[PDB]
Amino acid sequence: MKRHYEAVVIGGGIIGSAIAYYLAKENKNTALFESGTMGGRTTSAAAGMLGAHAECEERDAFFDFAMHSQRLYKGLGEELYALSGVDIRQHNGGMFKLAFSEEDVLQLRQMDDLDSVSWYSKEEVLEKEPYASGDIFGASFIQDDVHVEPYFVCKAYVKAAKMLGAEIFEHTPVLHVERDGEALFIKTPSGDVWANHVVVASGVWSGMFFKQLGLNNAFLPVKGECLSVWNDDIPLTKTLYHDHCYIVPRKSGRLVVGATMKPGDWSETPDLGGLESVMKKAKTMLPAIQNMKVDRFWAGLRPGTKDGKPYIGRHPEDSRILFAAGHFRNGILLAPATGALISDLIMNKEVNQDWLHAFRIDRK
Amino acid sequence: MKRHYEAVVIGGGIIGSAIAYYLAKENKNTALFESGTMGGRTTSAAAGMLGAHAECEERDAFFDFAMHSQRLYKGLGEELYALSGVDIRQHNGGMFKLAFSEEDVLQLRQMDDLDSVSWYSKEEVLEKEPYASGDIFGASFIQDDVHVEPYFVCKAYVKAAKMLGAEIFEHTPVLHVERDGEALFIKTPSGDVWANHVVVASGVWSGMFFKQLGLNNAFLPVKGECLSVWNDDIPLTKTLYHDHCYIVPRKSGRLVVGATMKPGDWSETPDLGGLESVMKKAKTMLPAIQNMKVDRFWAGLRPGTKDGKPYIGRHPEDSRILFAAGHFRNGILLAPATGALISDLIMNKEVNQDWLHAFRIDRK
Amino acid sequence: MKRHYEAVVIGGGIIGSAIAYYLAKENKNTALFESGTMGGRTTSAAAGMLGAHAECEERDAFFDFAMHSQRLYKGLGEELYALSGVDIRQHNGGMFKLAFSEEDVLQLRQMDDLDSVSWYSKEEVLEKEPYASGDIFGASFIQDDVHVEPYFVCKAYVKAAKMLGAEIFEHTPVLHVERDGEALFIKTPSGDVWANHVVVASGVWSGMFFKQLGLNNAFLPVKGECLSVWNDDIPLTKTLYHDHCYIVPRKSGRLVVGATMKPGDWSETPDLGGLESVMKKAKTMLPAIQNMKVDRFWAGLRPGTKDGKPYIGRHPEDSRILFAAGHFRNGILLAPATGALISDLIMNKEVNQDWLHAFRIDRK
Amino acid sequence: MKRHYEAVVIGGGIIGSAIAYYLAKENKNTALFESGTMGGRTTSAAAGMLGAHAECEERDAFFDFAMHSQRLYKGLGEELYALSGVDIRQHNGGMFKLAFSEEDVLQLRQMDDLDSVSWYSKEEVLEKEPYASGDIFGASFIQDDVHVEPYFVCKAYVKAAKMLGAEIFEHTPVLHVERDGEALFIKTPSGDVWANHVVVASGVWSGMFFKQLGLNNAFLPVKGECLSVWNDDIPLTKTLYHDHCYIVPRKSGRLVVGATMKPGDWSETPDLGGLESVMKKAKTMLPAIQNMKVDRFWAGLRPGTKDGKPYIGRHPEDSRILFAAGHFRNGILLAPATGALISDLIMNKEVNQDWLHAFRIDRK
Ligand SMILES: Cc1cc2nc3c(=O)[nH]c(=O)nc-3n(C[C@H](O)[C@H](O)[C@H](O)COP(=O)(O)OP(=O)(O)OC[C@H]3O[C@@H](n4cnc5c(N)ncnc54)[C@H](O)[C@@H]3O)c2cc1C
Ligand SMILES: Cc1cc2nc3c(=O)[nH]c(=O)nc-3n(C[C@H](O)[C@H](O)[C@H](O)COP(=O)(O)OP(=O)(O)OC[C@H]3O[C@@H](n4cnc5c(N)ncnc54)[C@H](O)[C@@H]3O)c2cc1C
Ligand SMILES: Cc1cc2nc3c(=O)[nH]c(=O)nc-3n(C[C@H](O)[C@H](O)[C@H](O)COP(=O)(O)OP(=O)(O)OC[C@H]3O[C@@H](n4cnc5c(N)ncnc54)[C@H](O)[C@@H]3O)c2cc1C
Ligand SMILES: Cc1cc2nc3c(=O)[nH]c(=O)nc-3n(C[C@H](O)[C@H](O)[C@H](O)COP(=O)(O)OP(=O)(O)OC[C@H]3O[C@@H](n4cnc5c(N)ncnc54)[C@H](O)[C@@H]3O)c2cc1C
């Protein structure tokens, strides 16, 4: 552990890992501190949908940022594999957003004018996916709302960062950021470090740092429970999505299934009632899943903010300190654009003012 | 591996392990052959209830054998620990057989005249176990229908048998039993061995040997799926039982919960619909289970016979061959009595004639 | 389960799975029977090297068959993914066969005349792989001796076969093949089935079937123990190979490490002494591995034959019966060529006579 | 969660769980806060030896406290089971401290004058334990240095505390302790709570709180790596111990084997070189272990202090604050005595002054 770094990142989920990579790529001398292991919390619980078209209700700067991040994934697998040897496991089948009523149909068809979406009738859906529930009314097909394996996107980013000279410290929680002197310094149980810039990317745990730095921004966990099964018997290429729940086919032959929403629960392991509810929902979407062998079950904590949008930007009173936290159901999707925007700010490059405004820290 | 043994046991579940122990205690030179690892199939799936009082319909020979076997468990843990160093994990809390209707109350109170049983009102049940469902009408308390951990009963028996001289061959499937000569022989992939007596204790897989030896006795698997949770928050001492389903409190703090009944299914891991149904049923018996963290899921194959009773006895044309298989939901309970009976028969000792008839091979 | 099939395959490792696929692709009505789960035995233990240049000592028909099978892998990932949705996880880094003495150098340089191999000096090796042991003398670089994840090659083959109409029966061991009538029929615990052709692909367990069919061909297990670690800190692209031991970098960031050779041991789980020896060897090849976190440990049984070559062909007295078993350290490599050769025979196509001879059943 | 508690415990390992129990038994309104799950860190890594006689150098106050704590285990299993339903799994076989040189024999025989100990010759050791290494010179037999399973001691204490009224908050890290007011308060991400007394029992992570409260007491992790195997073949009743390494027979049939010593390492999973060294050492103590099937690998962080002794006592400037942390290799042994001492201090009862001095916070 060196005494001085140009940039220090606090937290090693997908968000901090991406930021470290983009900083290292700009030749900033960078360190990352993670309390546990890289990718070991909410990042490991995520399905991995690049779900930009759960964001086009409202068609605003948040949708625009989401589509930009989706485009950034285009060459990303190759770029990171060349440096890390780690495959992000991209699956380009796309998504059927299912309807189970005429009310569902009217809501989904509001997206018809987007070039990125096409409406499929009940019969057109079943020709492509014969095992989708016969109670559907049709589905919006979203070709580019693909998926990746999030733990491996995170490991790819961090290994690439390391090969570009970033210094990674697992099992090293950050206790304090100060703030006082002409440089920031951070305190850890194994010594102290100075930095020209500090980035807080500690997910749902980020509130301690806002408060330490004179800011009241808070986070509420919304727990989500999931399971996986082996699909050894039927074809399924597209992701199936309904009412924030999903069945995602991975290239291992597993299906990933979720999820509950349990506000205010900080526990990271699933309950019996939660898993029961996940099973019940999945069966309404793909009836044949009742016969599939169960693999695993898990949970994670979504980092909920007051208004439901992330904080991505500078401390309003100190440009040396930055935050990137509060990606509720979209942190995998938004990892590259988040990483790029934070790196650009630290480098004093011009950035998109609509995104700078939308994600700013002081939203009064 | 020797050329000849006085007795050979085929199968290393709880039934075969018990038989080898009783035989070695009689100073029979004994070997046991098991296809995989000891206790690795149906024995590992069982809850471990000593459920004699799910067996008192017609209060007959089968009920008498069950009560005898239950009594044989009295000093067993201490006996086997002295030779093996393995604890069978006996829990003497007893069982509440619950009622959820006036029909249930009638059926259950027919046991009131037995010394083994006492009726509890709704209010008396909730005094002892406040978290039992408030929809009950009361319960029968059976003090002696206690529980053990069946994998460790199996390991205790086999290690005890080893210390007394038995030779145990894991990863050694038996392919054939030959009758034609003065003594028997068996064939394995590691070589062929002679034996004075052979005992078939291969569970639901026993059909192959019956057929090989001129008998049409057949087995149907009835698969059962179970789950466990951690009970970190409430007191629960007694087992809860209703309509062949159960919640069994272990001394680790886990609850064992089951079970489905799927006839004709030879698969040994649980599917999604089965686990969903187990969770649904458990919640009606103990509502607070909804909030408990899930630990593990599993399944096993009950060995079903034409009339639901096991075959424990000699081949009717050859007293050198014996069978001990088809213990449907009662093989943990019946392991000691089954072992003692087969060993007594090999020794040509007098045995109970009602039991010998009830479990005979030739039932037409 | 139907009464009649055109072709029946006994065993569901990678070999039987491939054969079922090629038969289904020829529109033969096919069934496969597997005792347990698909790919669940020796196939799951394998590293997955396509190791043809461990076969060019002797430069004979076996080397030629191995190179042919390696070429068959070229478009295989894509062909199977299109039908199954399962990714075989191919890694095209290639292999350094290391030397640690001048005697090693002379032996490896015997391959220099092959276009598929280039000799690298000590310094040339370390420029590509700086963490390979500094005690090496150089290495042969074998560009096309790449690797795949064998469990997933097997799952891809079987899911593709199913989509082409093959019928797959897990948890259905075959008890007997007969032989007697104008058609073969096979016996299982859940009923009997007739077939115009039967293929034995039961790996190290295949001996029972040879013997049932009047043939004395035998198999000896050679157990191999392995482990995996997480490589989160150093670059490693090429497989490292020395004296039948190896370090294989997977695209998850894990390294796969092996292996012991324990003749006559049928146990399928690793010993303490075996794993210790694997650790010791790995450290001599890649010293930095001592600091890497351990992931998993496992074992499997290599199917050893008398002369060390597989049996791939017809029963000499009955062209309806075929065998494909005894691939010692090369069954992953040889899976496509094995599958193709068996399918071609069943279809009465002309085949390569050198390969037909080399792998024939009656090698006197 | 209430606004105020009479006592608050920070940390839910074995030390904190014990403290909460003794406090609730005194009818103190008590809460305990734990960052993750109860017993989930160093407590889960421990073998569970009650090793008082690895503590008799200078036969001093520390040895006396160890013997007192060992005596407190006498009725503990039964006491905690009555309230919790959780078995601590005590094994009363005792310990052989082995000698492999004349130097070892001299050191060990200095304990001969204690009532707790008896010397055994080589021949007398091998009579009792035939599989101990034949290279030994004899061993000291310590009957009372028995073992328990530490995770279940922890779970028993906490569940017992709950039944007596303690309120337990998992997934609730404490960020700060404030001294300035009439009562203390603590800050958590779920809100801030007042308390009359606060006890810091956060193991190797306790340094943060010392520093927060004006004290420079520091902690260094000494990581230890262990493994387990299945002992299915030999008798082993006594624990074997040599040079801080051990083989501990559990009543499940497992052996627990350890351990390395890696100062300065905060990582909590084992590396390859560490496990290799544990296997090598175990084979010198019990050669037959080479053939045993491996079960599990793990690691944990010993909380090392400047002089190797724990801090158990009051903050020297504020009697409302207490610490109980830095139990290096003896925290399972010392849990009962540590709990009773902290509880007695909170109650203002008279305590042993030698012990109060030996473990005081201000050692300069
Ligand atoms: C059920 C579920 C499914 C989801 N599915 C999707 C999906 O399909 N698509 C999508 O885009 N999003 C999805 N999400 C959302 C996504 O998981 C999150 O937005 C994302 O993982 C947040 O990333 P992060 O790096 O901020 O947080 P985390 O992964 O939680 O990482 C934060 C890290 O900070 C560390 N930390 C905390 N405190 C400190 C400290 N003091 N010092 C050092 N380190 C510290 C932690 O140990 C942790 O590793 C899903 C979420 C859930 C729970
Ligand atoms: C969900 C579930 C819950 C249950 N709960 C209870 C309960 O609470 N109480 C109770 O009393 N009972 C219970 N049972 C029933 C109990 O599990 C069985 O009756 C009992 O395990 C049967 O033991 P076994 O030794 O006959 O069979 P198994 O344990 O299946 O052993 C047979 C052995 O034979 C071996 N074998 C097969 N073929 C060969 C061969 N060719 N050569 C060598 N070896 C071979 C197998 O590998 C296997 O290990 C339960 C069952 C299920 C499924
Ligand atoms: C440590 C290790 C590493 C290896 N690494 C490599 C490598 O890198 N490259 C390579 O090419 N090879 C490697 N091998 C060799 C390779 O694993 C084998 O050659 C290959 O898996 C054999 O395939 P199989 O289908 O014949 O056997 P298996 O995978 O063992 O399949 C046979 C199947 O038959 C079933 N069966 C048995 N009896 C019956 C019955 N009565 N009825 C129905 N089914 C039955 C079994 O359940 C089993 O699933 C390695 C082997 C080991 C052990
Ligand atoms: C390999 C190994 C073998 C050992 N074998 C033995 C043995 O045989 N016998 C013996 O007596 N001892 C043994 N020990 C030592 C023993 O494990 C320890 O002395 C003991 O576990 C310490 O318990 P603890 O409660 O202090 O620490 P821990 O169990 O580490 O508990 C501390 C708790 O504090 C929590 N925490 C930290 N920060 C906060 C916060 N801010 N807010 C809330 N909670 C927080 C943590 O999450 C943790 O659960 C062994 C140790 C090792 C590593």
Provide CB contacts within 8 A for C167, sequence distance 6+.
C1, C2, C5, C30, C31, C32
Chain B residues with CB-CB distance to D84 below 8 A: 253
In degrees rounded to 5, what are phi and psi of residue A292? -90, 145
User: Is A313 within 8 Å of A322 (Cβ atoms)?
Assistant: yes
**Residue A148 CA: distances (Å) to CA of A46, A89, C39:** 10, 5, 26
d(CA A86, CA A80): 7
The DSSP string of D165-204 is T-EEETT----EEE-SSSSEEEEETTEEEEEEEEEE--GG
Residue B300 CB-half CA count within 13 A: 23
Place of tokens 């290494």: D133
* Cα C331 off chain centre by: 2
Residue C133 CB-half CA count within 13 A: 23
Continuous segment of H or E residues that includes residue B353: helix B353-358
How many CB atoms sit inside 10 A of residue B169's CB?
18
Residue D301, beta-bridge partner list: D223
Structure tokens of A7? 């940039």
Nearest CA in chain D to B149: D252
Task: Read off the DSSP letter of residue B274.
Answer: H
Kindly determine whether residue D291 and residue C269, on different chains, have CB atoms separated by under 8 Å.
no
Using the Cα atoms of residue B108, residue B109, residue B115 and residue B120 in order, give the sign of their dihedral.
positive
d(CA D219, CA D221): 7
User: Is C141 within 8 Å of C122 (Cβ atoms)?
Assistant: no
Q: Which ligand is nearest to the CA of C34?
A: 3
Phi and psi based region of residue D325 (left: phi greater than 0; alpha: psi -120 to 50; beta: remaining):
beta
Residue C8, beta-bridge partner list: C31, C198
Phi and psi based region of residue B134 (left: phi greater than 0; alpha: psi -120 to 50; beta: remaining):
alpha
d(CA A246, CA A259): 7
Q: Pocket around ligand 2: residues whose beta carbon is below 6 Å from it?
A: B 10-16, 33-36, 40-43, 45-49, 51, 173-174, 201-203, 205, 224, 226, 258-259, 300, 302, 325, 327, 329-333
Closest CA to B236 of B147, B357, B334, B105: B147
Chain A residues with CB-CB distance to D266 below 8 A: 171-172, 189-190
- C329 annotated among ligand-binding-site residues: yes
Using the Cα atoms of residue B165, residue B169, residue B173 and residue B179 in order, give the sign of their dihedral.
negative
Q: Which ligand is nearest to the CA of C189?
A: 3
Determine if ligand 3 sits within 6 Å of the CB of residue C331: yes
Provide CB contacts within 8 A for C168, sequence distance 6+.
C12, C20, C31, C32, C34, C38, C158, C161, C162
**Residue B28 CA: distances (Å) to CA of B166, C53, C126:** 9, 55, 64
Question: Nearest-CA distance from D292 to chain C in Å?
Answer: 5
Closest CA to A22 of A347, A350, A348, A340: A340
Nearest Cβ partner for A251 among C85, C162, C235: C85
User: Is A301 within 8 Å of A41 (Cβ atoms)?
Assistant: yes
Closest CA to C226 of C173, C191, C274, C184: C274
Q: Tell me the residue type at A4.
A: H
d(CA A340, CA D183): 48
B273 touches A at CB < 8 Å: yes
Closest CA to B20 of B171, B206, B198: B198
**Residue C72 CA: distances (Å) to CA of C69, C210, D141:** 5, 29, 66
Chain A residues with CB-CB distance to D208 below 8 A: 175, 189
Task: Read off the DSSP letter of residue D271.
Answer: B
Nearest Cβ partner for D208 among A175, A208, A269: A175
d(CA D71, CA C160): 66
Note if the bond before A179 is cis, omega within 30 degrees. Answer: yes
Q: What is the dihedral of CA A99, A102, A106, A111, to 10 degrees?
A: 20
User: Is D69 within 8 Å of D146 (Cβ atoms)?
Assistant: no
Using the Cα atoms of residue A36, residue A42, residue A43 and residue A47 in order, give the sign of their dihedral.
positive
d(CA B216, CA B212): 9
Nearest CA to ligand 2 atom 5: B46
In degrees rounded to 5, what are phi and psi of residue B158? -70, -40
Kindly determine whether residue C253 and residue A159, on different chains, have CB atoms separated by under 8 Å.
yes
Chain A residues with CB-CB distance to B269 below 8 A: 293-294
Kindly determine whether residue B235 and residue D87, on different chains, have CB atoms separated by under 8 Å.
no
Structure tokens of D302? 């010993």
Domain residue ranges of chain B, discontinuous segments joined by +: 1-91+145-218+306-364, 92-144+219-305
The DSSP string of C266-284 is ---S-BHHHHHHHHHHHHH
Closest CA to C177 of C359, C345, C9, C363: C9
Chain B residues with CB-CB distance to C170 below 8 A: 267
* Cα A94 off chain centre by: 18
What does chain D come to in residues?
A: 364
Residue D247, beta-bridge partner list: D240, D257
Structure tokens of C139? 């290495």
d(CA C112, CA C92): 21
Q: Which residues is chain C interrupted after (C–N above 2.5 Å)?
A: none
Structure tokens of D154? 């922890």
Q: How far is the CA of C158 from the centre of ligand 3 (A)?
A: 15
Continuous segment of H or E residues that includes residue C341: helix C335-346
Closest CA to A156 of A215, A230, A86, A98: A86
CATH architecture, range B1-91+145-218+306-364 = 3-Layer(bba) Sandwich (3.50)
Provide CB contacts within 8 A for C48, sequence distance 6+.
C147, C148, C149, C150, C153, C248, C256, C332
Task: Read off the DSSP letter of residue B165.
Answer: T
Residue C302 CB-half CA count within 13 A: 25
**Residue B228 CA: distances (Å) to CA of B152, B240, B249, B275:** 17, 14, 10, 11
Provide CB contacts within 8 A for B193, sequence distance 6+.
B1, B2, B3, B4, B5, B8, B31, B185, B186
Q: Which ligand is nearest to the CA of C36?
A: 3
d(CA C96, CA C285): 11
A1 touches D at CB < 8 Å: no
3-state secondary structure of C188: strand
C226 touches A at CB < 8 Å: no
In degrees rounded to 5, what are phi and psi of residue D203? 55, -140
Residue C170 CB-half CA count within 13 A: 18
Structure tokens of B348? 């040509």
**Residue A343 CA: distances (Å) to CA of A72, A97, A197, A279, B41:** 15, 34, 11, 41, 56
Question: Nearest-CA distance from C156 to chain B in Å?
Answer: 21
Closest CA to C98 of C262, C246, C311, C202: C246
Q: How far is the CA of C48 from the centre of ligand 3 (A)?
A: 12
Chain A residues with CB-CB distance to C232 below 8 A: 38, 155, 158-159
Closest CA to C9 of C151, C206, C148, C228: C206
Integer Rg of chain B from CA: 21
3-state secondary structure of D322: strand
Q: Tell me the residue type at D189.
A: P
User: Is B342 within 8 Å of B312 (Cβ atoms)?
Assistant: yes
d(CA D262, CA C305): 47
* Cα B333 off chain centre by: 5
Q: Tell me the residue type at B42.
A: T
> Ligand 1 pocket: which of A43, A187, A301 to mutate (most atoms <8 Å of CB)?
A43
Note if the bond before C259 is cis, omega within 30 degrees. Answer: yes
Closest CA to A154 of A266, A279, A43: A43
User: Is A222 within 8 Å of A300 (Cβ atoms)?
Assistant: no
Nearest Cβ partner for C267 among B171, B208, B264: B171
**Touching D: B residues 157-176, CB under 8 Å:** 158-159, 162-163
Structure tokens of B355? 């039991």
Burial A31-46 (b: 16+ CB within 10 A, else e): bbbbbebbbebbbbbb
Give the experimental resolution in Å. Answer: 1.8
Longest CA–CA separation in chain D, Å: 67
User: Is A87 within 8 Å of C252 (Cβ atoms)?
Assistant: yes
3-state secondary structure of B154: helix
Q: How far is the CA of C212 from the centre of ligand 3 (A)?
A: 21
Using the Cα atoms of residue A353, residue A354, residue A359 and residue A363 in order, give the sign of their dihedral.
positive
Helices (H) and strands (E) in chain B, counts: 11, 17
A218 touches B at CB < 8 Å: no
SS in 3 state form for chain A? CCCEEEEEEECCCHHHHHHHHHHHHCCCCEEEECCCCCCCCHHHHCCCECCHHHCCCCCCHHHHHHHHHHHHCCCHHHHHHHHHCCCCCCECCCEEEEECCHHHHHHHHCCCCCCCEEEEEHHHHHHHCCCCCCCCCEEEEECCCCECCHHHHHHHHHHHHHHCCCEEECCCCCCEEECCCCCEEEEECCEEEEEEEEEECCHHHCHHHHHHCCCCCCCEEEEEEEEEEECCCCCCCCEEEECCEEEEECCCCEEEEECCCEECCCCCCCEHHHHHHHHHHHHHHCHHHHHCEEEEEEEEEEEECCCCCCEEEEECCEEEEEEEECCCCCCCCCHHHHHHHHHHHHCCCCCCHHHHHHCCCCCC
User: Is D116 within 8 Å of D143 (Cβ atoms)?
Assistant: yes
Structure tokens of C177? 């093949």
d(CA A323, CA A314): 6
How many CB atoms sit inside 10 A of residue A100's CB?
16
**Residue A28 CA: distances (Å) to CA of A25, A164, B277:** 7, 10, 56
User: Is B145 within 8 Å of B50 (Cβ atoms)?
Assistant: yes
Chain D residues with CB-CB distance to B232 below 8 A: 38, 155, 158-159
d(CA A149, CA A83): 18
Q: Beta strand A167-169 with A30-33: parallel, antiparallel or unpaired?
A: parallel
The DSSP string of C286-306 is -GGGGGSEEEEEEEEEEEE-S
d(CA C50, CA B363): 57
Closest CA to B219 of B200, B198, B246: B200
Burial A61-86 (b: 16+ CB within 10 A, else e): bbbbbbbbbbebbeebbeebbebbbb
Q: Beta strand C220-230 with C262-263: parallel, antiparallel or unpaired?
A: antiparallel
User: Is B13 within 8 Å of B204 (Cβ atoms)?
Assistant: no
The DSSP string of D52-120 is GGG--SS--HHHHHHHHHHHHTTTHHHHHHHHH------B---EEEEESSHHHHHHHHTTTTSTTEEEE
User: Is A3 within 8 Å of A193 (Cβ atoms)?
Assistant: yes
3-state secondary structure of D234: coil
d(CA D100, CA C161): 62
A207 touches D at CB < 8 Å: yes
d(CA D234, CA D257): 16
Q: Which ligand is nearest to the CA of A20?
A: 1
Nearest Cβ partner for D171 among A171, A172, A267: A267
d(CA A227, CA B123): 39
d(CA C32, CA C199): 9
Enumerate neighbours of A (3 or more CB pairs within 8 A): B, C, D
d(CA A247, CA A255): 6
User: Is D90 within 8 Å of D96 (Cβ atoms)?
Assistant: no
CATH number attached to the domain at C92-144+219-305: 3.30.9.10
Provide CB contacts within 8 A for D113, sequence distance 6+.
none
3-state secondary structure of C360: coil
Q: Tell me the residue type at D86.
A: V
Structure tokens of D219? 């902690």
Contacts 24+ apart (CB under 8 A), A107-110: A108/A139, A108/A140, A109/A140, A110/A57
By CB neighbour count within 10 A (0-12 exposed, 13-18 middle, 19+ buried), where does B199 fall? buried
3-state secondary structure of C21: helix
